[PDB]
Amino acid sequence: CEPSQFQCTNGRCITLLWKCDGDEDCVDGSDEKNCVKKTCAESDFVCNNGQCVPSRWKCDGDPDCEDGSDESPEQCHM
Amino acid sequence: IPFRLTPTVCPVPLAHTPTVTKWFKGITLHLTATRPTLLTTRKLGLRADAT
Amino acid sequence: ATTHVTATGSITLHFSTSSPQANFIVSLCGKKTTCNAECKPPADHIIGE
Ligand SMILES: [Ca+2]
Ligand SMILES: [Ca+2]
């Protein structure tokens, strides 16, 4: 697209300010890829492999981590 | 020397679109602007009376 | 620049001129005709093209 624009895989041009900013806008997901790690957030739970999930998903009874660490008893002791 | 000057994209204000009153060999712009705004006019001919 | 031609009929054509008089020659498959009218000055003063 334009030099000040980023081209998604669907042929739609967005701005570079929308590249790696947390929200996905390129339909398929061409944005929010590569760049640097987002290192989760202060209000987000960190899975053992490095995946970031919302903190309300920690020990809710259902697995949400890829490795299933969110339901492990090591972090929440029943 | 850290903190390299890099080219990014920034938003810049868009002024109010001027109403044009149209007379026989001229235009009159009304040009409301709260802040200083650059108006540049040129003639599309041999002598560009650039104001 | 190119129009369709039936065995008989009429075709409309838009033209732009600068003369006050429309006394030019129009050709249609090389057949020449002469138009004649008086072209009024425009009312709007400023145009975008
Ligand atoms: Ca985005
Ligand atoms: Ca969960």
Q: Is A70 exposed, middle or buried (0-12, 13-18, 19+ CB in 10 A)?
A: buried
And the tokens for C14? 């838009």
Q: HSE of A72 in the Cβ direction (CA atoms, 13 Å)?
A: 11
Surface of A (13-42) touching B: CB under 8 A? 15-17
Which of the 8 DSSP states describes residue A66? S
Is C45 at the interface with chain B, CB within 8 A?
yes
CB B27 within 8 A of CB C47: no
B14 CA to chain A: closest CA distance, Å? 18
Q: Considering only CB atoms, which chain B residues are within 8 Å of C44?
A: 22
Distance between CA atoms of residues B5 and A38, nearest Å: 23
E strands within A1-78? 5-7, 13-15, 44-46, 52-54
CB A13 within 8 A of CB A36: no
Q: Considering only CB atoms, which chain B residues are within 8 Å of A15?
A: 9
B20 CA to chain C: closest CA distance, Å? 10
Listed residue (A1, A36, A2, A30) closest to A18, CA to CA: A30
B11 CA to chain A: closest CA distance, Å? 10
- Resolution given for this structure, in angstroms: 2.9
And the tokens for B1? 């020397």
Distance between CA atoms of residues B12 and A78, nearest Å: 55
Count the neighbouring beta carbons within 10 Å of the beta carbon of residue C23.
13
CB A21 within 8 A of CB A38: no
Which residues contact residue C35 at a Cβ distance below 8 angstroms, ignoring those fewer than 6 apart?
Answer: C22, C23, C24, C25, C26
Question: How long a stretch of residues is chain C?
Answer: 49
Give the pairing of strands B26-29 and C25-28.
Answer: unpaired
Distance between CA atoms of residues A9 and C40, nearest Å: 55
Distance between CA atoms of residues A49 and A64, nearest Å: 12
Q: Considering only CB atoms, which chain A residues are within 8 Å of B9?
A: 4, 15-17
Angle at B24 (CA atoms; ends B22, B29), nearest 5 degrees: 30
